[PDB]
Amino acid sequence: TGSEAWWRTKTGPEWIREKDGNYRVTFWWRDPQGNETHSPIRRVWVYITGVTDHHQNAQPQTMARIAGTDVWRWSTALSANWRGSYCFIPTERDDVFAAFAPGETPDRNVLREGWRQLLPQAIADPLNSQSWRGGRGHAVSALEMPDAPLQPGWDRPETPYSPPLMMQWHSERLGNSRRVWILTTGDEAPEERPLAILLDGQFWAENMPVWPALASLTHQRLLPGAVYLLIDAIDTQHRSQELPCNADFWLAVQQELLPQVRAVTPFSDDAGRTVVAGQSFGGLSALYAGLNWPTRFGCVLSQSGSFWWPHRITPPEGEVITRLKTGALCARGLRIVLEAGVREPIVFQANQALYAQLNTSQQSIFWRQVDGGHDALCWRGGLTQGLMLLWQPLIDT
């Protein structure tokens, strides 16, 4: 153990199927500065989305080294259907988090604060080649248990016949400029092609490119030839101001953006196959769009929707949840995919309350629970599955 030949057998996290059906998963990190006497490393935090972070109010988990070697280790239990991102934070610092007694639920606010000081130092798993830029400012790695559901398109990525195009969208309504990406996956009946709008376009166009997965599903006849519009959120300041129920954003998209997009490639005016898909504030904004302009956006795809907005500390209460409760807004004729993970309690509970509220006979709602959390590795699969659900009627032809 801890030898050169021993490290050769390690390809990343290892798992063992237990009696109950869950897995004992072990993580390994090789200290490049040697053993105790040589390496000045104090901590090696294991930050797994929805498992060891603030979403589970978990006490900060750090690895421990096997005395005498440069091997750090840490294990945990994970469900069979789970999938999620993770990263390690090897540091010399030991003055960030406070002490925690066994069985003490820490304050979530205190956790995020503590993590905001360490995450910039976070790194992907050097043993795992399935890594990418997380979008939050650090690299991450992918882990999937054997029964994680298939992620349509991402399993058989195929090159798109048409390359993605980029356009600079200058908004008079918003008073700012921004990038938008356009992908088309079919030329037949161009005016019948459904339009699908994806928020946080920068991520789905650069950090985790959605084109190969979309083209693959189209080639398999599991998605119709469509027109995909990815919109850049720009940055945190703008995104936090434009996505959480901001009417100008959607007014601007309809009056300024869609006509420009329509000038380059045709798409259907039928709200019934017009999708607005987003995650987190993007999910909230997509439903908000469908709720306020159902004549233009009839299909909503909300993944981990921030329906706890504006106040996170209070999950069941939400702005969109209040409008539906009184009667100002109503999902009539809308097809809605509402996804949320069990590893994001606040968000999950918020989505349940939202579901109960709008669940009437006058609309088609698809509830999807995910064994995972506030994680783009999971969302990527729900994104493609969600489009299949929202477009199920067309796809059947």
CB closer to Cl ion out of 133 and 323: 133
CB closer to Cl ion out of 119 and 245: 119
Binding range to Cl ion, per CB under 5 A, among 97-105, 196-204, 284-292, 340-348 = 97-105
Q: How far is the CB of 141 from Cl ion (least distance, A)?
A: 13
Binding range to Cl ion, per CB under 5 A, among 94-102, 283-291, 292-300, 307-315 = 94-102
Q: How far is the CB of 328 from Cl ion (least distance, A)?
A: 38
Q: How far is the CB of 343 from Cl ion (least distance, A)?
A: 21
Q: How far is the CB of 63 from Cl ion (least distance, A)?
A: 13
On whether the CB atoms of residues 265 and 197 are closer than 8 A, the answer is: no
Q: Is the dihedral of CA 273, 235, 122, 76 positive or negative?
A: negative
CB closer to Cl ion out of 118 and 127: 118
CB closer to Cl ion out of 250 and 281: 281
Q: Distance between CA atoms of 177 and 198, rounded to whole angstroms?
A: 17
CB closer to Cl ion out of 97 and 267: 97
CB closer to Cl ion out of 125 and 371: 125
Q: How far is the CB of 120 from Cl ion (least distance, A)?
A: 10
Q: Distance between CA atoms of 90 and 113, rounded to whole angstroms?
A: 18
Q: Which residues are known binding-site members?
A: 308, 311, 314, 317
Q: Give the type of residue at 344.
A: E
CB closer to Cl ion out of 4 and 94: 94
Short-list 160, 186, 174, CA closest to 238: 174
Length of the chain: 397
For residue 113, count other CB atoms closer than 10 A to its CB.
13
Here the tokens at position 121 are 């130092």
Binding mask 276-295 for Cl ion (x = CB under 5 A): --------------------
136-139 contacts at long range (C-beta below 8 A, 24 or more positions apart): 138/87, 139/87
- 115 forms part of the interface with Cl ion (CB under 5 A): no
CB closer to Cl ion out of 210 and 376: 376
- 118 forms part of the interface with Cl ion (CB under 5 A): no
Binding mask 39-78 for Cl ion (x = CB under 5 A): ----------------------------------------
With a CB cutoff of 8 Å and minimum separation 6, the contacts of 219 are 158
Binding mask 319-348 for Cl ion (x = CB under 5 A): ------------------------------
Binding range to Cl ion, per CB under 5 A, among 61-69, 86-94, 152-160, 175-183 = 86-94
- 96 forms part of the interface with Cl ion (CB under 5 A): yes
With a CB cutoff of 8 Å and minimum separation 6, the contacts of 390 are 273, 275, 299, 300, 301, 335, 337
Q: How far is the CB of 98 from Cl ion (least distance, A)?
A: 8
For residue 35, count other CB atoms closer than 10 A to its CB.
15
234-243 contacts at long range (C-beta below 8 A, 24 or more positions apart): 234/176, 234/178, 238/176, 239/200, 239/281, 240/281, 242/174, 242/285, 243/199, 243/278, 243/281, 243/282, 243/284, 243/285
- 307 forms part of the interface with Cl ion (CB under 5 A): no
Q: Distance between CA atoms of 289 and 311, rounded to whole angstroms?
A: 20
Binding range to Cl ion, per CB under 5 A, among 96-104, 167-175, 311-319, 388-396 = 96-104
Q: Give the type of residue at 48.
A: I
Q: Is the dihedral of CA 132, 136, 140, 142 positive or negative?
A: negative
Which alpha helices (DSSP H) does 300-361 contain, by range? Answer: 319-326, 345-358
Query: Which residues are bridge partners to 64 per DSSP?
Result: 73
- 133 forms part of the interface with Cl ion (CB under 5 A): yes
Q: How far is the CB of 111 from Cl ion (least distance, A)?
A: 12
- 97 forms part of the interface with Cl ion (CB under 5 A): yes
Q: Which residues are known binding-site members for Mg(2+)?
A: 308, 311, 314, 317
- 206 forms part of the interface with Cl ion (CB under 5 A): no
Binding mask 144-183 for Cl ion (x = CB under 5 A): ----------------------------------------
CB closer to Cl ion out of 200 and 371: 200
Burial 251-266 (b: 16+ CB within 10 A, else e): ebbeebbbeebeeebb
Binding site for Cl ion (CB under 5 A): 94, 96-97, 133
